[PDB]
Design a protein around this nucleic acid. Structure first.
Ligand SMILES: [Mg+2]
Ligand SMILES: [Mg+2]
Ligand SMILES: [Mg+2]
Ligand SMILES: [Mg+2]
Ligand SMILES: [Mg+2]
Ligand SMILES: [Mg+2]
Ligand SMILES: [Mg+2]
Ligand SMILES: [Mg+2]
Ligand SMILES: [Mg+2]
Ligand SMILES: [Mg+2]
Ligand SMILES: [Mg+2]
Ligand SMILES: [Mg+2]
Ligand SMILES: [Mg+2]
Ligand SMILES: [Mg+2]
Ligand SMILES: [Mg+2]
Ligand SMILES: [Mg+2]
Lengths: 49, 122, 72, 175
RNA sequence: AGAGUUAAAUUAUAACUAAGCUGUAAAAAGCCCUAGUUAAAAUAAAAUAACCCACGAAAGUGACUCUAAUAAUCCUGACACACGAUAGCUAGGACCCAAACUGGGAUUAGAUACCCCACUAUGCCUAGCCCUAAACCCAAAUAGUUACAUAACAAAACUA
């Protein structure tokens, strides 16, 4: 399973060709790692702003 | 994903940023690394003022680079990012997705401790 | 309680250290003397050995190093 | 020194089917190339336990333990060559060496054929402990050196005296 | 153990502004090349988390990152082997701040002290020594039991 999984993920890695495209791609798409918790044990996410 | 590169870049325009990211990743692939992904956490005001390369910096761009690399080479990449004048501050952490979460089964309550003293009648 | 014992030793030690300070170069002299003596008794022990083995001179190339008189 | 080649494809992924059909990149991520040091130790351990042993399946056997411990020891050696002043690992090394040796002295007393083989294969050399551990100090070292030189002189002189005796008595007996 | 890094302080050093600043139970001496604010390398030391109790054989270890890594299919065992807080020694480098010593100021009958100010060896790094601590949890290691059973106090009593 691990080898197959990595076999899949490898399609997506950054290479000498993808460099130009991928970089310009990532410069377009900001991501957040941010989220908060509630006293209940619940996750709260910011993107609803 | 094996290592995580936390890059804080000097805040600049589009092309120059793109250039810095490109040359950085290239250096990574030359130290033998395989780069999985490139993430952009945006540009913000830095939490405190960061002094690097005879500049006192206020804002910065934030990036993550997940990559696999031979253990030997972290020192090398580190050296390289050190002397790049476009990097506000570099760091390389073991990728947080390698460590996996064990299960808090819960909080085992601890009883008050007993027999700390003898049965003497004062 | 127990300190009375400690106190005693404490005093003893102090008084003795004091004394080593006063008596110092006297002590130096006596220890250097004992070291010479030691070296000598050692040489005699060796000489005694090669003689009781019937030899006249010490065996070829034997210098009998100075171990105790070794420079501080 | 041995060389578990960079491309060697770590222990756990060696026997999974059709591995060799996978593209260069994944093969590369499963290599000893991207590996830890601990993976190179796993490999080294397997390889040694295959060269040296008889039944690589028994972890329990004395011989097996000796091989394993020997891998660990060679590893501390490497580490100690890089860090001279780490006293903690010096401890592990000296200690773990004593354990090896204890086990060897236990093989030699039980299965000798195997012990013989192991010592040959791992290049370990088994020395008997001395009787009397005493610190050789300046006085004793010197005196003993003297006593040995004295002895060598004396018996050489008895040899010369017997040469003179033989020559004299022979040249007398002839005429 | 290595290598890399630095948030809060602190300081060289300028720029303004003020005549004082520092210091005590209270003063004096010191400093005014001082003080407050604004800027700042190096050095050293690691708030909070910790009401946690982990790692290491012990001494010890609680800023961050990576590399290497924590003997034994696990009984006891030296005078043998390898370590070992602080202080101290040798050599080279560092020096913010602390500080034995010493010099000033008080205090006092005296004050070679406690209190105030300066400053040094030293605390730091590299390399080598030194091998000592109330190195004490004053409770040896390894297996066990809670039976019999209170000198006192303390951390209950005991077997092999
Ligand atoms: Mg007395
Ligand atoms: Mg300076
Ligand atoms: Mg005055
Ligand atoms: Mg801290
Ligand atoms: Mg263990
Ligand atoms: Mg033992
Ligand atoms: Mg010491
Ligand atoms: Mg020292
Ligand atoms: Mg010095
Ligand atoms: Mg100084
Ligand atoms: Mg001071
Ligand atoms: Mg005085
Ligand atoms: Mg060092
Ligand atoms: Mg202690
Ligand atoms: Mg004791
Ligand atoms: Mg014991």
């Amino acid at each position: 399973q691990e080898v197959l999984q990595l076999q899949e993920e490898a399609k997506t890695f950054i290479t000498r060709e993808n460099l130009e495209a991928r970089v310009e791609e990532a410069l377009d798409s900001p991501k957040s790692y941010n989220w908060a918790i509630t006293r209940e044990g619940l996750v709260v996410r910011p993107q609803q702003k | 994903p094996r290592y995580e590169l936390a890059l804080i870049l000097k805040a600049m325009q589009r092309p120059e940023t793109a250039a810095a990211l490109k040359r950085t990743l290239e250096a990574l692939m030359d130290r033998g690394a395989v780069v999985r992904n490139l993430e952009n956490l945006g540009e913000r005001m830095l939490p405190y003022k960061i002094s690097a390369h005879n500049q006192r910096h206020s804002r910065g761009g934030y990036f993550l680079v997940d990559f696999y690399a031979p253990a030997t080479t972290v020192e090398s990449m580190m050296e390289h990012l050190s002397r790049d004048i476009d990097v506000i501050r570099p760091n390389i952490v073991k990728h947080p997705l390698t460590q996996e979460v064990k299960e808090c089964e819960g909080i085992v309550p601890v009883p008050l401790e007993e027999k700390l003293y003898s049965t003497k009648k004062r | 309680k127990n300190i009375l014992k400690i106190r005693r030793r404490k005093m003893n030690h102090h008084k003795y250290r004091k004394l080593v300070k006063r008596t110092r170069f006297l002590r130096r002299k006596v220890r250097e003397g004992r070291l010479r003596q030691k070296q000598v008794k050692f040489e005699r022990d060796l000489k005694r050995i090669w003689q009781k083995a019937g030899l006249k001179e010490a065996p070829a190339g034997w210098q009998t190093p100075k171990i105790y008189l070794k420079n501080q | 020194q041995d060389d578990p080649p960079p491309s060697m494809l770590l222990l756990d992924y060696q026997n999974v089917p059709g591995i060799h059909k996978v593209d260069d990149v994944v093969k590369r991520l499963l290599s000893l190339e991207m590996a830890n040091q601990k993976e190179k130790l796993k490999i080294k351990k397997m390889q040694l336990m295959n060269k040296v042993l008889e039944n690589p399946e028994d972890t329990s056997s004395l011989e097996a333990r000796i091989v394993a411990l020997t891998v660990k020891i060679r590893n501390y050696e490497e580490h100690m060559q890089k860090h001279r002043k780490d006293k903690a690992h010096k401890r592990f090394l000296l200690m773990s060496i004593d354990q090896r040796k204890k086990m060897l002295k236990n093989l030699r007393e039980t299965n000798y054929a195997v012990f013989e083989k192991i010592c040959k294969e791992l290049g370990i050399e088994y020395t008997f402990p001395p009787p009397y551990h005493r610190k050789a100090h300046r006085r004793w070292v010197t005196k003993k050196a003297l006593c040995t030189q004295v002895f060598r002189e004396v018996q050489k002189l008895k040899k010369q005296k017997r040469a003179l005796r033989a020559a004299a008595v022979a040249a007398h007996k002839q005429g």
